[model samples]
Target: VELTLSSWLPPTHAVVADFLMPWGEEIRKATDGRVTLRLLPKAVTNPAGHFDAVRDGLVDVTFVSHAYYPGRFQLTKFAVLPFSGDTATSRSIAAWDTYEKYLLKADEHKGVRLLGIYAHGPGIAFTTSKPVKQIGDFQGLKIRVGGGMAADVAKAVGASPIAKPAPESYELLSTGVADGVFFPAESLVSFKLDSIIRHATEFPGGLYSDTHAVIINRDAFARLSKQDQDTLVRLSGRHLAELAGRAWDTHDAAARKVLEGGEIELVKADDALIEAVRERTKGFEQAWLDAAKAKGIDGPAALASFRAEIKQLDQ
Candidate 1:
């Protein structure tokens, strides 16, 4: 059976070409074309449209970052909490395990079926003109943000958010408009953002992380012959999560070389400086749990359980 997938990150981004594109090719070849996948690289869906697209069957499969849709998944915003220090692979495994074990709301994702849940490595703060080491550094600076954890961190540090699609980040930087951006390192080279960014702030443990997933329409998936459904379900979750996470882990190293050899200077944020950022996140995470509790979701228990899981994995 042919699988039609969608993405909005553009053709050159690893989310498309590196992970989905190559993964699609191998799937089809492995099954001798019984597992065809239509790789839609921004030719079809956009990010905000993912939920509806999946609900209405606009695409059989696609990815979404809960980090990009904070109001929709408030618990996931904790994915960005600093110092958790889980490897992309380990965190992803934990994330999927947790989703199945505790979280999956049949209502929130009612019409849709999940294949895999994944995450990128923690974020890197990139600046085009100046190196930023302290909160005072970004006074009035414009930083591109993905609208949630990253944006909250930027706001806490006094930077203004220049909200836009990925393509616009490079343009905003090159034109001497936006001052910097907060994103994963792989994005530096993938989005050709390395040409413009000159500094990278490595905040320990992780500045933040972006969540990702592979979603299919539940009915569409269920309609397949039982064996075919089993094949898709079995191949889709753990293996894909591991494959994509490891791909990103490697691509991050490759992007680092491309940026380092060029004008970009990567610097680790001082422990004190990183701690200041951590204090700010304390408020954000607490506010999220409070709001979740107000919605009658037993926010405290979930938060505690999640943190316990993090500690278990971190050690």
Candidate 2:
């Protein structure tokens, strides 16, 4: 069975090249050529529309950022919280484990088959003008955010948050529509913003992170033979999350080198700046707990488990 895979990112992007391509090949190999993936020449819909497109069978499979749909995905916000983890691999794996143990009961992704969930590396503050040396530096700055926790973080730091997709970042910055962006290191090069961005202020752990969900159409999965379906399941969950996370980690490292050599100035947040951010964003975790409790999940227990898993994996 050949299934169509739609992607909103550039074909060369790590998520598409390193993760999705290898995943498709694995499926083909595991199914003994009985199953294959056909990547569409273009995205079936916009980035935010990927989930709906896949769920409605417009595409057999796709991955979407939970941040793109703000209120639509509450439980997934756990992976995006500030200072959650330093590496994408640990955070991604922990997120998948937490979802299996806690979030699956919420059925937040009921319309589609959620193969796995993963997060990008830590989010940094990238500015085009002045360097963000303190919390006051964020004031009045128009910062582009992918929404969700990033938006909240931007607001908490006193920056004017402008919600936009990743692909629009270059245009926004070049045209002076935005002064900065809250993004992972890989995005500096992936979105071609490294040249224009003047400074990168990195907080301990991260100011915020974002989550992505891999999904397959329910009907598409149902159509597969039971053996092939099992193969797909076996290759997903923690396996897929780790694969995607490793790709992000690889790309983030490479991009850091690019920034190091390039004209952009990388600044580590000083103790005062870090402490200020912590003080302002401390309530975010409590807010998430409240949301989780509303969903009938034991928020504190799940968060503790998630952190424990991250600690183990990070080691």
Candidate 3:
């Protein structure tokens, strides 16, 4: 039986090119064409609803931003933390590793068989009208951001956080509803925001990064032949995560390079600005730990392990 795969991204999106297509091809090869993917013409559900679509069996597989469904799967939020890492590939691999070691014990990703988890490249700040030279430059600005960490960074810098879907960010910037946005560099090309966003400010690693999940319907996996099921299990984990991470990094670099001349301005975050944001958000890590404890998770140990893994594997 052909598994139905759904994606919110356009067919030409990097994720499709670098991961999904190749991964799908491999799955076909592994199953000897017994099990293959049939990507739907468009997503059967919204980005946030992808988890439910797969769980409820509307789609056999899909990937979605875990950040969109906050509180329900709070442990996954660890992937979005600021100062996470320098590249999407490292962060994504480390995220998958951490989830395998710790968060998986929480069973937060229930219903569906979570195949893989990954993060985008460093999420930097992009703006119109003004460049963020100092942390205070965020003051009074309305910035579109997703996830708890990105929202916290906006607040720490005194910017108002505007929650919106990534697809709608261009409208937010074009309409003047938001003066800036927190997004990965790839978004410039993905969302077509390069012209609208003239100034870009990059922090070491990223200001924040959000987590995404690729999953298969529980029943769908069970219905597959034992060999096919095991094949998918063996192929997914770190392989898929690393593939996605490399894609994000490649897309990020491509987006920046594409904008190299013209009116686009790129600036690195100053030490003072970075230090101030770090100090302001230091409590974020502790807060997550406290929340994790409330849910009976070993927050400190998970965090320590996550940090160590990030440092070791994110190089």
> Who wins the lDDT comparison?
2
Better of 1 and 3 by TM-score: 3
Clashing pairs in 1: none
Candidate 2 lDDT tens digits, 196-227: 99899887778899989999999899999998
Tell me the whole-model lDDT of each prediction, alpha carbons only: 0.73, 0.91, 0.84
Residues 223-254, model 3: lDDT tens digits = 89998889998889898899889998999998
Worst 10 residues of 2 by lDDT: 256-265
> Can you tell me which runs of candidate 3 are displaced by over 4 Å?
none
lDDT score, residue 64, model 3?
Answer: 83
| After superposition, candidate 1 runs with Cα above 4 Å error | 25-33, 291-315
Indicate the TM-score of model 1: 0.88
Q: What's the ranking of the predictions by lDDT, best on top?
A: 2, 3, 1
As for model 3, its CA RMSD to the true structure in angstroms is 1.4
| True-structure lDDT of candidate 1 | 0.73
